[PDB]
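Researcher: I need the complex structure. Ligand is adenosine-5'-diphosphate. Inputs:
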Amino acid sequence: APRRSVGELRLLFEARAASAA
Amino acid sequence: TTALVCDNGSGLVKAGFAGDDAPRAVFPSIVGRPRHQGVMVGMGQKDSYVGDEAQSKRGILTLKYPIEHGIITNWDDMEKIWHHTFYNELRVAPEEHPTLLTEAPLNPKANREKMTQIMFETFNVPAMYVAIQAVLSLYASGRTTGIVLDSGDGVTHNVPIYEGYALPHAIMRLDLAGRDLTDYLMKILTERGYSFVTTAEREIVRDIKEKLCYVALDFENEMATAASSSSLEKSYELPDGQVITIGNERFRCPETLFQPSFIGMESAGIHETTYNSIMKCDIDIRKDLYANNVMSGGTTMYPGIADRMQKEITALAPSTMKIKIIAPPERKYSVWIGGSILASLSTFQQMWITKQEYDEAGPSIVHRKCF
Amino acid sequence: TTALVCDNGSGLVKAGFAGDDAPRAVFPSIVGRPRHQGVMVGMGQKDSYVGDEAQSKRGILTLKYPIEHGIITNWDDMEKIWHHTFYNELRVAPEEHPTLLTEAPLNPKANREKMTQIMFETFNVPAMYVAIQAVLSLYASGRTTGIVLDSGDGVTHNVPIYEGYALPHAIMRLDLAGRDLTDYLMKILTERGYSFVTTAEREIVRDIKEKLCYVALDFENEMATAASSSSLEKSYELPDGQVITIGNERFRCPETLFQPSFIGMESAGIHETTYNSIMKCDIDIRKDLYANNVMSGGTTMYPGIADRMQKEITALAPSTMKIKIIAPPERKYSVWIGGSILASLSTFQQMWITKQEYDEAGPSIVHRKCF
Amino acid sequence: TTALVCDNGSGLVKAGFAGDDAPRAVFPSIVGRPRHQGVMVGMGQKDSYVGDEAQSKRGILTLKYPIEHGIITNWDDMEKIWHHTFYNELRVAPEEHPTLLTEAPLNPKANREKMTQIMFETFNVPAMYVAIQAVLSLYASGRTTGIVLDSGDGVTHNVPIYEGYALPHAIMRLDLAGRDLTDYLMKILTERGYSFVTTAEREIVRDIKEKLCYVALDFENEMATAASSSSLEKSYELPDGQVITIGNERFRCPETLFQPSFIGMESAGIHETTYNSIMKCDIDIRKDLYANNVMSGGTTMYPGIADRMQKEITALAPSTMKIKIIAPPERKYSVWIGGSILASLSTFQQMWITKQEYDEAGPSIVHRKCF
Amino acid sequence: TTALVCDNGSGLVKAGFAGDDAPRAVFPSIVGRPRHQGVMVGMGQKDSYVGDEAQSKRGILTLKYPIEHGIITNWDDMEKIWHHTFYNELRVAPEEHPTLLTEAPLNPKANREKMTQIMFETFNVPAMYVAIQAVLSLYASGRTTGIVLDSGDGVTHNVPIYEGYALPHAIMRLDLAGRDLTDYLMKILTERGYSFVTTAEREIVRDIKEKLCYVALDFENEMATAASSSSLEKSYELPDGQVITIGNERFRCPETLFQPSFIGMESAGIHETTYNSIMKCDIDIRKDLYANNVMSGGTTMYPGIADRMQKEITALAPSTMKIKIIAPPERKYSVWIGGSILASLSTFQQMWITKQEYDEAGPSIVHRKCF
Amino acid sequence: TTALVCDNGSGLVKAGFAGDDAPRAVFPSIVGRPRHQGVMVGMGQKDSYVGDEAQSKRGILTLKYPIEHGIITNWDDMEKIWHHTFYNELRVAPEEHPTLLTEAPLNPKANREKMTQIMFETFNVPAMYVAIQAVLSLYASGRTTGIVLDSGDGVTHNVPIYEGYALPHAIMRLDLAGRDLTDYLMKILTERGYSFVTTAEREIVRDIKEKLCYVALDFENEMATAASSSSLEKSYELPDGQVITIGNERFRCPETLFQPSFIGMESAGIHETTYNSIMKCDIDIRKDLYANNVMSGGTTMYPGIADRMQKEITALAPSTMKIKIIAPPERKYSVWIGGSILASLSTFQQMWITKQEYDEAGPSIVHRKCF
Ligand SMILES: Nc1ncnc2c1ncn2[C@@H]1O[C@H](COP(=O)(O)OP(=O)(O)O)[C@@H](O)[C@H]1O
Ligand SMILES: Nc1ncnc2c1ncn2[C@@H]1O[C@H](COP(=O)(O)OP(=O)(O)O)[C@@H](O)[C@H]1O
Ligand SMILES: Nc1ncnc2c1ncn2[C@@H]1O[C@H](COP(=O)(O)OP(=O)(O)O)[C@@H](O)[C@H]1O
Ligand SMILES: Nc1ncnc2c1ncn2[C@@H]1O[C@H](COP(=O)(O)OP(=O)(O)O)[C@@H](O)[C@H]1O
Ligand SMILES: Nc1ncnc2c1ncn2[C@@H]1O[C@H](COP(=O)(O)OP(=O)(O)O)[C@@H](O)[C@H]1O
Ligand SMILES: [Mg+2]
Ligand SMILES: [Mg+2]
Ligand SMILES: [Mg+2]
Ligand SMILES: [Mg+2]
Ligand SMILES: [Mg+2]
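Model: Output:
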């Protein structure tokens, strides 16, 4: 996978937090 | 206030504000002190130089690293490196910025305590945390499941993780990394008479290692090819313009990661310790660890290291397993990028060690809260 | 409103609306709780996994079954399994749907009372009933007369019935079923070194049991054949791609149903307890019980179990009796299909425990109305 | 001719003639092979060293144990250990002396077969037997009834016995023993920076474990005391005279027997598996098992382990039961002493596997005669 | 035929037949060429003089050493030194006598190859070998285990050995030896105006170094004593009868072995590199290395060097360790005596490089066989 | 009061107040004593003449230099030269003016001590210092880093410096300078019969050397050109009007700096000793030494010496290195200008040897404070 921003990666972990919730 | 991420790994400090894509201060974790007489007055001739200052003066300084095998051995100089990091490079007063430190796993609790003491009593920082570097390396790769293989300047460690839930019994740490590779490269460059012995020369052989070395895909056949032909030889120009030429040393140096017995290290190689770490994991999750090998740290940057690692684990692991290695670009900075994610993550703001908790519980608090 | 059928048997919940041909929710009656240190953030907010979710995370969870030997031992987790069944799988509010539970016979009245309390006070259900699983198993076959052999995950029981009129003195329950078969299979797989010890591995040996095992028609000659030739050996692939090979263990495992002394269980085998149950029946009806053995429950699914059972009872029963075994397809779901019939039978709508009767009589009501 | 008893347990071989009060050869079950170059000719520099030879040369050898978790993994080196046992330590030709081997229960039949092959075809021994170590441990105490807890270097197992008649369904084996304790002690000694990584260092941490460690009577309060005061700290001197100091690690190490989750082992502790083994026994005999717990094996030698075990089982077992633990002195050698009794018992001389029976029946004979 | 041992170390050739107790040819490894005009015909005025010829003509020759820091820099003159060694001093034809050469460790493979080429193609010798000088130095002491510290004219190196099995990762070589001591002695003798600048004067200051210098036991107090009193001053008579007087220079010269920073060398001192070499060894063997420090080479001949080395290592090493230094008489010749042993050892006659092996494999063979 | 700088180098005294751009007293360091009878009374006929006095009377005086090879040989006459410098030339009382002396490096400590004694006890000066001439020569250029090549009347020396921090092991001093050039010029002018033998004639050949001589760019081709054509010949007029003509002597004289063997000096030339001095420096700084060769002293004034030096070092140094020579105008006075800077630098006023420190510590103080 190509480089992606921390601004992008954070929202993946916020989405995964909502999935774990 | 925007959080602060300071990867006091070995060899290079990576530091910068949280939420940035890359560390805005990267410099060597070196303190250098003048080696010779002080003949020429009319200058500050200052007692100590750190980072790029020390590199710019390399050949008159006794360079020293105050963190060795991921362990801070020399707190008086490490506190100079932190002072330089905060006040000269980042140009920020730490008493406004909560600082995410990080360290290797399986590391003396005295270190984590002294880092806590120094951060809360020298720099008065509002809050602090000490994440495991390999856990950060998953955040940088957007993963939630995988083995992480971090291979730094001073230590190499494996941490398997599955939807969270790091398996602490399956963690392994090797004490073999880029310094042992540099010193072995010096030992084998002695075999054709480039005598490097000073720490300045150690710092040049680090550059030779970074520029020329690569990992052989098939070490016996690469060794035979370098014996039969000069095609693998490369020429490099020393700071004084003396040309050197290097051959089978070019891949014999990083091969010691896969064959530690070359440096007399007894341990299993990095492929074997990766496999044995997966073998310490419960049998259900191994397929996803094989599918999610994450590589991080500067000594994973060697060309072909991912191909060699995949070959070796595919030889170790059962024939059906889809062995995959996530070794992206910028994996050198992945520990810092993972800290830049974690320190800015909205759920992590519960996790800081506040200074009130330190005033209540002393250095012992950082064993209770941090993993 | 359409009735609701929830077969909280052991091992698997089967649940679904009455009148459906098959249970639309089938999932393991497992609650799993994390075993390890949760280092990443994005976990731990959810701290208990149920059913197929516990299978999807098998290798990081301490799996537990809250119903053991057909007895609910752990009401706090069983109430989680019921919550999951109603709200997540069937996606229905139980306060509109009368729920047919079912349980094994000869079972502590404290269980039937706590199930009543939970159904009427946690889920507020309009009405409830607790049918005997073997009585349900007749409806799915269409019999009115027969031996029922139910053999579940936790218990095995025989209930003879004749035009109605279950003979309560001739009921027998064995406490030997698929969990004892799994644990004995683990004990004998240890004989060639596949060490399974975790509950995740118990859950894999359950799959090995379901995929490979079968019941020998002539155990001594099958054992001699497996000793003399590898033709009976089968290979299976573990979740990590490690191949295992299995031989006489393949039929020695389910043979323990016919020879409980293999697991140290004292009792007579399932053929002998079937015969002794017929021998407790009045001598006029025995010919129709021999002509109507009904087999149900998942551990009756083994290939050849009907042939072995017929051989053994034909050796036990008098030479004239036409021993016949009704072991159809889907006999794994026959208890649920029988509940789907009964709950939708127009004659049965008198039989529900209404919530008014519970408000008048407390848990004791379910001993007065239900058989 | 006087029989021969050779306890090839893990970690230490105990061997000697039957009827002796103590094994006259006790040495570590280690094979070591030179790690480094062969620089200095004029010496045999021999290819392999075993036992005390390997300990005397520890720091230049890659030590390996050919028996792992009570399972012989490396027959080529185990046959060297047997050769050393017979010809160098006991100084006897096995073709005159019938040899009582012993092994742990619930152990791969391939091991018992390969031991049979090796004894009858390499050493030509007149006769052989393979007693279960826990059954032997009764003879050394003089009991006829009890639940034996053997806890070795590689395995721990419980075997309840009543006037004879070992209950094979109630046997349990844990795969947790002194090696897992050594490796966890290494992991926690890393917490204050004594990095032990070589097998020589593993062999030193085994000595630290034997000299310093003890089992806490009340682990939470001992942990709090070691946190509040240095009174529990002890100093030990490494082979090079470097002093180390050890504190809560001193009892956190053997505590993992009671809390296997410290090493990530999921299983119940040794007190819980002892209780569950008694709970697998028929309800009449439990009172005499509680009255006759027999402890054996080197990892039962920890100070206070009997007191802690008695506390934990008295908390588990019903309040009336007279929980008693028979943990005598020399219980480290009780398995050998039990073999020295059994091999010299006149009733046992019927029981040997004769070489004629092996020539008739191959390795399979040792499953038919031996328990 | 009796073997031949030719220690082409730096500064002095030691040569003689194997089995002799002492080298029968000891002479300086010097080639001298006439510096001035050729005024006086009627003489050969020959182009070159070597050894004692060059010393006897010292003041008209530009003396040069063709081996520098253990590395042969000048093969055209080294081949003259070998010719002189064989034909003029030993008076023997090398084509009958297999020649044991020796060299320092960690030395360019081009040297070992060119020595092989020269021995097999110029001198046609039947066989050859190239032992490490420190490995030879054990044989002359009779040890099998120890650190060897060899300190020659051109190089100093540490090699730890244990029952054999030299630890190649713990070898260290310092590039500081008697020439650096001579040049520093010249630099400090300049401090009171004895200007020595010619190579003839370098060769006289070598004699002053050998005759007068000693190693201070407590350098600060010896320096203060030489500052406070003339009692430490000694007078020496130059070849022309000019008296010189020497004071604190007498021990400041060899002190640079312990404080290399005096010559601007950055490396740790010889005591520190001895300790660090023991610290590279596995922790079990360190006690026997401390018990077996072997000193060899001419620059270990200074009075008091053993006492100073013992004091310094006893300050470095743990207080319990029995630090012992084996610095016998004739330790100047111990490398040759060790070669005289090894070349006459009957086990060694397998080890020679035969000329057939060179004709098959060229110079590369001497990396395969020799250590 | 403004400090005083008195460069008692060889051949010429340069003296003057600090802060002046050029020394206001420059005169030869000569003492002359009447050679002949005292025939003519009525005059003082005074016993001694110094400086321009001695030059004005040259042909009746036995001229002598009291400083030889940078070493003061004749303190009774040097004290006359200092007396003349202070009282007759500068016309100042030294007891008000702290005096910065200077001397060459690697010079007998007896000189620095006697200069200290004389300054503090004959001239009662308030304070004194003794800077190394080459360190002063940097200040006049404005460098902080460089090779300094000082080439005086009596000595030539190389001192490498880097941001300060003179490397004392890499200093070299040659004892070859303008007096050896004068004496060789006299020896070769004898080849066409200009017999110069008196010290007056030595003082005339010094003028011939300064006026006519130059350094050949390509000595072999200049020698061939002077052999083939008279174009290189120059005519000079002696004080008595005798014309002399000079040819290949014109560049053969200063060529001896590059080929000391012409005067029988064995040492490497000034280009070779410059390169070898850079080669004693650590490999990182060599590029800045090549970029910063500083030339100073009167014998660097020869036309073409910078071009020849650049050619020779560019032939010696690696092809990439940007060899640059800083040989400015007034480099004859650069040592004095550097003293005029240093003595007026405000940071230096800490560095003076005060007379209180001399009264406390005697001549030994000037080894402790001064470099
Ligand atoms: N491009 C490269 N190729 C090979 N090695 C590299 C490269 N870049 C850095 N390294 C090596 O990686 C190490 C530094 O890695 P780093 O990640 O900064 O350490 P840490 O993990 O302790 O922060 C050094 O040994 C350095 O020589
Ligand atoms: N096809 C099959 N072959 C063998 N065993 C099976 C098969 N299907 C299910 N089982 C076993 O039957 C048991 C589950 O039966 P089930 O009827 O769901 O229990 P219950 O009667 O309590 O509802 C488990 O032990 C499972 O392993
Ligand atoms: N006094 C002691 N205290 C604690 N541990 C001990 C003691 N003696 C032996 N051990 C440990 O017990 C193990 C050896 O037990 P042993 O009975 O010889 O094994 P096995 O049962 O396989 O023969 C080793 O791990 C050793 O460290
Ligand atoms: N008695 C002595 N005291 C001090 N130094 C000595 C003595 N004898 C020899 N040396 C010095 O030792 C060096 C020669 O040692 P040697 O062992 O011959 O060298 P190598 O090890 O290369 O053969 C020379 O520097 C010499 O000056
Ligand atoms: N222009 C010149 N050309 C050649 N040689 C010169 C020149 N000027 C001075 N010299 C020589 O340089 C020497 C004086 O140099 P100087 O720097 O005054 O000595 P010091 O370095 O001891 O002060 C004398 O030998 C003089 O002949
Ligand atoms: Mg890092
Ligand atoms: Mg069922
Ligand atoms: Mg045992
Ligand atoms: Mg030598
Ligand atoms: Mg000068």
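Model: Summary of the prediction. Residues 14 and 49 of chain B are 18 Å apart (CA to CA).
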